Amino acid sequence: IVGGYTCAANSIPYQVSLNSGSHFCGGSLINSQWVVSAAHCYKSRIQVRLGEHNIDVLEGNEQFINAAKIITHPNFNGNTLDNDIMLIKLSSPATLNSRVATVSLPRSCAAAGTECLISGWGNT
């Protein structure tokens, strides 16, 4: 995130970090077993790190759960990034609490001009 601010710790409780040695992508927890992410973040093995704020320091709210299934959209186009969506099944259910929570799927598309919240550990 370029030009953002630091989120209040654990104020984005649906945000996860995808880790294969180090952080490489984000995701969103949509139920206790499933993270939605981007298909171009696919790796054959992924550790999902929930409850994170500082991804370099153990703070005490983290849950580290390896993926059991990684499902890219069948019509993902790796050249154009069309259908860039992926689902990750946790090998055990996350424990939902005040720092690890789900985000609702949309009930309709957002209107142009709607204000949204974007988050991640990407380059600043």
Binding site: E52, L87, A112, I118
Partner: protein, 98 residues
Amino acid sequence: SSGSSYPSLLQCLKAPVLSDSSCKSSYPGQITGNMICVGFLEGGKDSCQGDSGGPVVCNGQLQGIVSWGYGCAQKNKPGVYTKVCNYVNWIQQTIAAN
């Protein structure tokens, strides 16, 4: 772990959904109906490498997944996001069967 260039702490950004005509004119020939632009045409504020897969949440609902862009925070090159309101059935049915 954040390695060479990522931040340690989770970053946040408030940004508006952009019109489809703004999106297509920012990225001629590259925008499908499964993509939405979110951000600022004046640049300066955007998602970037390492953010992909992460959320765009509007009014409590996941509307976007960080996907791609030309550069980061560049003028007339807002972030391009996977349009989640196209995929609720894919998501629910894939979860239900797996």
